[PDB]
């Protein structure tokens, strides 16, 4: 079940009321929102994209920071077993929450080294016109509470709790967060370098791929592939529309995106056009694209 201050959460319930009713949740929300955004460098960084998962331990020598960005209607979930330090950061978008939370629990339940507890963190979203962040918080709190293990909700800065307004238009306060693995500390962050194969991994989610695990903590490798997808319908039609009609249909929040999000869409749609089926074209021998952390903390191809 999902616990707050040692007591169980009664569901359904909005996160705003859940935070107001419990001081330590409000304490974390006031602090997290007041943080000036940090520019996290590429050293020791493991960037998680939308609909991706990454789990590791402080015993890792390569990775020391997990993080994700561009969370408008998504929720960046952080699960961590305190004591041993097994940390999992995923970028949940709500395509299939019923099957994604078991992926998060299993990523942590394999690390067994008893001591500590399970702490979960929920950040992102705003009050959008489509009630997407509200439905995603509902699903995430219900799937965690349906679990057997006791999970303690520590952070909950989502939707109404993460919303700001300019010119009578709403958009989120926190677009991304980084979590430092050695010290279990979460903070607002931006990411200039977003790891290798950005267009390949983004096109996988835009084509309709499911949530995947992108890091193997045993070998400390980044494993991108192999991916296969149906050719995206009407790639040339969307590659010729204006910026306004691109955000309205390819984005879950047309007016709440960070700048140059259309460039991200056009670049990603361009990738799907050149590679209609990347099954046996980008992955020779059907082996994944393997990466390891450099001496200088960068992702270098093996």
């Amino acid at each position: 079940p999902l616990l707050v201050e040692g007591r169980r959460v009664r569901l359904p319930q909005s996160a705003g009321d859940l935070v107001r009713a419990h001081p330590p949740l409000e304490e974390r929300a006031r602090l997290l929102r007041g943080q000036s955004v940090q520019q996290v460098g590429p050293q020791g960084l493991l960037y998680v994209q939308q609909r991706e998962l990454a789990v590791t331990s402080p015993k890792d020598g390569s990775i020391s920071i997990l993080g994700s960005d561009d969370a408008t209607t998504s929720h960046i979930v952080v699960l961590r077993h305190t004591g041993n330090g097994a940390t999992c950061l995923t970028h949940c978008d709500g395509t299939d929450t019923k099957a994604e939370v078991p992926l998060i629990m299993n990523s942590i339940k394999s690390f067994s080294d008893q001591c500590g507890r399970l702490e979960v963190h929920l950040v992102g979203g705003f009050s959008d016109d489509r009630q997407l962040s509200q439905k995603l918080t509902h699903q995430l709190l219900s799937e965690f509470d349906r679990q057997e293990d006791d999970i303690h909700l520590v952070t909950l800065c989502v939707t109404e709790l993460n919303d700001r307004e300019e010119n009578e238009n709403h958009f989120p306060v926190i677009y991304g967060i980084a979590v430092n693995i050695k010290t279990a500390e979460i903070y607002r962050a931006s990411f200039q370098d977003r790891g290798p194969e950005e267009q390949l991994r983004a096109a996988r989610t835009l084509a309709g791929g499911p949530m995947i695990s992108i890091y193997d903590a045993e070998t400390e490798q980044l494993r991108i592939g192999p991916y296969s997808w149906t050719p995206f319908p009407h790639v040339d039609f969307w590659l010729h529309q204006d910026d306004k009609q691109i955000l309205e249909n390819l984005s879950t929040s047309p007016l709440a995106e960070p700048p140059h999000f259309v460039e991200h869409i056009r670049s990603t749609l361009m990738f799907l056009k050149k590679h209609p089926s990347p099954a046996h074209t980008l992955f020779s021998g059907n082996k994944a694209l393997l990466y390891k952390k450099n001496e200088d903390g960068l992702w270098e191809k093996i």
């Binding site: 939308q50 609909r51 408008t72 209607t73 978008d93 835009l206 879950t252 990603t268």
Partner: peptide
């Protein structure tokens, strides 16, 4: 955010 991307709509699947």
């Amino acid at each position: 955010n991307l709509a699947a």
